[PDB]
Design a protein around this ligand. Structure first.
Ligand SMILES: N#C/C=C/c1cc(Cl)cc(Oc2ccccc2OCCn2ccc(=O)[nH]c2=O)c1
Lengths: 415, 548
């Protein structure tokens, strides 16, 4: 390898020190995998061993590449990211193509390897320090720091941005209608082409990047034009009971925090007496009319809801049972930028944690394609459980921010 | 004079700072003349060096005396320097657990003397370690010094010494991969399956290698023989246990003493099964005064008595064999306390432990069991680097029902059912749909925040109405009280309708126990009922759900 230019100097925000984060305990399997991977990486000059005079640490995990039988090392750079990249969202910050979500097909390619041929600033290397843990704290961990641009660090594509633009320039000339956006280790490519044409063009880009020196072990298609804010659905019933009208009035009353132009009164007058829950109550004209008015007002989106770039994105997920999960991406309460429902194959494959994980990945990817940044999740799972099992089913190269919720949503079936 | 040709670790001062300028005059002539004697001998060994005072720095130097005063000891307070020095990598946060150690035919403990003083200090940093011995009154020129090696009490000493020791062991471990060396503070712990003769030969070889680098090791045999008392553990050749625990007898207990007691019991719980800290720690709920005398309750003394009866006879843990399965077994103690044993063998425990739920007002057995399984999974991953097969006192139907209808996503690995009671079951289940042919109770409750009087009542579809007055209550408590009333006055199958999202939230969580007596009574009622359908409606929207 060679240094194409000198190393791009990297500074943090003045007053901010390097990341210091504990290394999560790992299975012997994953530890051995990381040991092999890092032995080879040390052999190739990508990383070097460090002494006690380096205080900083960043977590490391072992996952599967995609479906692959070979282990892949996933570094969690979220802290270092937050420290450097908020300045590198400014100085080297990559612009987001808001027209990407309009394309009928979007394919994701993994360009990460590109970063490994580029050296890292000598003064900055000490902040890339990570630790391969030992079982039962028997030995102090094995400590490395990166000699080259690390994967998972948002500064890496920022530094490689010029080279990427240069390499992509010929392809973008022959294909002016194709949108290409680089988020961290991944390249998102949109088109309006037929699936066959789209895949052929993606393969063209693969061979183009390959003959220019960029290996992409992609050897996964979205459709963002169908992505929107889902309408709230009122139950369609031939007849009704007292209980049903109660659920209806309740749900609508909850929806009033969203669409203030909803009136539940005429439905309230129909239950007026004190009745058994199972008593069938036929709808009147003044009632049914109100039901129709509240139905037609619920299919039209909200007024005054826009995306604030100064505010973080928040993704809430709730479990619907039977392999179904519902989610909302918002910023301020009750103003929803996005809503959706993730589903999976039913039985003898997936469990709860797997489904939630894949859901989080899907939501995160959507958020990347749309707003150019990832949401902070509120996860319906026990903290330690998730922290233990999240690396099993994780196929993504990035890590979204997350926290954990108690006090179960009664919304539930309402969404 | 064991000089060390060891590569030094480069050290910096925190950016913007400089060396400590603290000056020390005091005090006594005797201590001064005692300092000279030691400093000359340290200089002879090259550990320190005199310096011409060209704008140097300074650090306070005291002198103290151990028991058996034939030997003086010099002390240096590096606090001010330690503030200004750069941060270093943490040395060792946690310690290895004996249950995770593996059987070795021979084990040797080697403690290295003059550990820090045998490891050189970075040259350019040495000037920051400068200190002065005071002249005897008379404002006379003092004796300047600085450290050429790792000073005791200096921030960077333990980590630098650790890494230096590691690099020193590096060429030796390469020639002897069959032997395993652990490194803790000033101690090395070697072990091997080699025969005693070859083992001792290798130990002596290691001692010689270490001595070549300027690190001394014990001459007579090698030091201690098993035990092996280490970090509050007793390590035997074929077994491990905890150092003897002493539970003091007192006529009066204080927060401090209860802290020590709960500490000892917790520490003992890793091996002796059955230890219960719940009541004794519940005594400690008040965080206010540390010296406050706290009266023990009856449940607390009972619990402590059971703990004494458990601690009567000694028990031991075994070591880990990778070739055999890892099994975890959990039992409920009934108070919200759970106990567990981890074993590769039926009569032999690797270790034991307990899980208690401190957080939350209400919960159920299945959830607590899940949390326990979580804790054991984490602990197992830490200690043995894998996860155990679980033997659990819960039917697959109960578990599956619970996690299928649970709002939160849990998980448990492959597990097998154990019929040993008390079994974990679902004591009641709410109906998912309203009950035809069941009386419908519309319940409500209210309270005045000031007077705290309030009332709770119901009105049914059969025209039955009741209002019961309350005292010293709150809105939530009346909201639960109304539902309790409806449960009391109805048949085996009942439809309740509440205006309370609170009460609905508590009940829908299906708790089998709570720290509230009211919730417990409601639980009992829900158990006694054949069918209960609880439903919610918006409060003060006036449909069928009006006030009282
Ligand atoms: N002071 C003091 C000594 C403390 C000490 C601390 C640790 Cl972490 C390990 C240790 O012994 C070992 C050293 C190297 C490998 C395995 C070991 O243990 C294996 C288990 N074992 C324990 C005692 C015994 O006699 N035989 C035996 O097989 C000793």
């Amino acid at each position: 390898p060679i240094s194409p230019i000198e190393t791009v100097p990297v500074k943090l925000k003045p007053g901010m020190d390097g990341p210091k984060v504990k290394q999560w305990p790992l299975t012997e399997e994953k530890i051995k995998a990381l040991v092999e991977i890092c032995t080879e990486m040390e052999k190739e000059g990508k990383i070097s061993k460090i002494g006690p005079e380096n205080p900083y640490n960043t977590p490391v995990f072992a996952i599967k590449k995609k479906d692959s039988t070979k282990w892949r090392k996933l570094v969690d750079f979220r802290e270092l990211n937050k420290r450097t990249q908020d300045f590198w969202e400014v100085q080297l910050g990559i612009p987001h193509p808001a027209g990407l979500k309009k394309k009928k097909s979007v394919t994701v390619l993994d360009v990460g390897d590109a970063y490994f041929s580029v050296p890292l600033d000598e003064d900055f290397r000490k902040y890339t320090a990570f630790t391969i843990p030992s079982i039962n704290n028997e030995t102090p961990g094995i400590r490395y720091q990166y000699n080259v641009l690390p994967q998972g660090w948002k500064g890496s594509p920022a530094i490689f941005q010029s080279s990427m633009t240069k390499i992509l320039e010929p392809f973008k000339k022959q294909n002016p209608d194709i949108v290409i956006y680089q988020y961290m280790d991944d390249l998102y490519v949109g088109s309006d082409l037929e699936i066959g044409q789209h895949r052929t063009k993606i393969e063209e880009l693969r061979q183009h990047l390959l003959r220019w020196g960029l290996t992409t072990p992609d050897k996964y298609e979205l459709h963002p034009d169908k992505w929107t804010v889902q309408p709230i659905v009122l139950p369609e019933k031939d007849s009704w009971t007292v209980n049903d009208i109660q659920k209806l009035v309740g749900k609508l009353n909850w929806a009033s925090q969203i669409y203030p132009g909803i009136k539940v009164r005429q439905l309230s007058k129909l239950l007026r007496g004190t009745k058994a829950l199972t008593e069938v109550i036929p709808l009147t004209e003044e009632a049914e009319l109100e039901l129709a008015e509240n139905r037609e007002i619920l299919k039209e989106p909200v007024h005054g809801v826009y995306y604030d770039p100064s505010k973080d994105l928040i993704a809430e997920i709730q479990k619907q049972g039977q392999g179904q999960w519902t989610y909302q991406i918002y910023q301020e309460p009750f103003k929803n930028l996005k809503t959706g429902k993730y589903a999976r194959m039913r039985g003898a494959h997936t469990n709860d944690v797997k489904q939630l994980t894949e859901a989080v990945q899907k939501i995160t990817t959507e958020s990347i394609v749309i707003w150019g940044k990832t949401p902070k999740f509120k996860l319906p799972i026990q903290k330690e459980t998730w922290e233990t099992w999240w690396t099993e089913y994780w196929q993504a190269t990035w890590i979204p921010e997350w926290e954990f919720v108690n006090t179960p949503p009664l919304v539930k079936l309402w969404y | 004079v064991p000089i060390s040709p060891i590569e030094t670790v480069p050290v910096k001062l925190k950016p913007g700072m400089d060396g400590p300028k603290v000056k020390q005059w005091p005090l006594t002539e005797e201590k001064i003349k005692a300092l000279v004697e030691i400093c000359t001998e340290m200089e002879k060994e090259g550990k320190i060096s005199k310096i011409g005072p060209e704008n140097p720095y300074n650090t306070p130097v005291f002198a103290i005396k151990k028991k058996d005063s034939t030997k003086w000891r010099k002390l240096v307070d590096f606090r001010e320097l330690n503030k200004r020095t750069q941060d270093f990598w943490e040395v060792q946060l946690g310690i290895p657990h004996p249950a995770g150690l593996k059987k070795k035919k021979s084990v040797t403990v080697l403690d290295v003397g003059d550990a820090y003083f045998s490891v050189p200090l970075d040259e350019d940093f040495r000037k920051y370690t400068a200190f002065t011995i005071p002249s005897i009154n008379n404002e006379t020129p003092g004796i300047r010094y600085q450290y050429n090696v790792l000073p005791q009490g200096w921030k960077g000493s333990p980590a630098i010494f650790q890494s230096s020791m590691t690099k020193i062991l590096e060429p030796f471990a390469a020639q002897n991969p069959d032997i395993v060396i652990y490194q803790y503070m000033d101690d090395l712990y070697v072990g091997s399956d080699l025969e005693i003769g070859q083992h001792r030969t290798k130990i002596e070889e290691l001692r010689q290698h270490l001595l070549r680098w300027g690190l001394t090791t014990p001459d007579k045999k090698h030091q201690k023989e098993p035990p092996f008392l280490w970090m509050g553990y007793e390590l035997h050749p074929d077994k491990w246990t905890v150092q003897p625990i002493v539970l003091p007898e007192k006529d009066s207990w204080t927060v401090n003493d209860i802290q020590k007691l709960v500490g000892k019991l917790n520490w003992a719980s890793q091996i002796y099964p059955g230890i219960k800290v719940r009541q004794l720690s519940k005594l400690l709920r008040g965080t206010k005064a540390l010296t406050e005398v706290i009266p023990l309750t009856e449940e607390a003394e009972l619990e402590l008595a059971e703990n004494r009866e458990i601690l009567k006879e000694p028990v031991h843990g075994v070591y880990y064999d990778p070739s055999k399965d890892l099994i975890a077994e959990i039992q409920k103690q009934g108070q919200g306390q759970w106990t567990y044993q981890i074993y590769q063998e039926p009569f032999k425990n690797l270790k034991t432990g307990k899980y208690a739920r401190m957080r939350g007002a209400h919960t159920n057995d299945v959830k607590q069991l899940t949390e326990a399984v979580q804790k054991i999974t984490t602990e197992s991953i830490v200690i043995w680097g894998k996860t155990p097969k679980f033997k659990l006192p819960i039917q697959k139907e109960t578990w599956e029902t619970w996690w299928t209808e649970y709002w939160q996503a849990t998980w448990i690995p492959e597990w097998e059912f154990v019929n040993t009671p008390p079994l974990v079951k679902l004591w009641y289940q709410l109906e998912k749909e309203p009950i035809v042919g069941a009386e419908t109770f519309y319940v409500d409750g209210a309270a005045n925040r000031e007077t705290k009087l309030g009332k709770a009542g119901y009105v049914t579809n059969k025209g039955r109405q009741k209002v019961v007055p309350l005292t010293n209550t709150t809105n939530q408590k009346t909201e639960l009280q109304a539902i309790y009333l409806a449960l009391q006055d109805s048949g085996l199958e009942v439809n309740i309708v509440t205006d309370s999202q609170y009460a609905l939230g508590i009940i829908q969580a299906q708790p089998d126990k709570s720290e509230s007596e009211l919730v417990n009574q409601i639980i009992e009622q829900l158990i006694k009922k054949e069918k209960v359908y609880l439903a919610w409606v918006p409060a003060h929207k006036g449909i069928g759900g009006n006030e009282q």
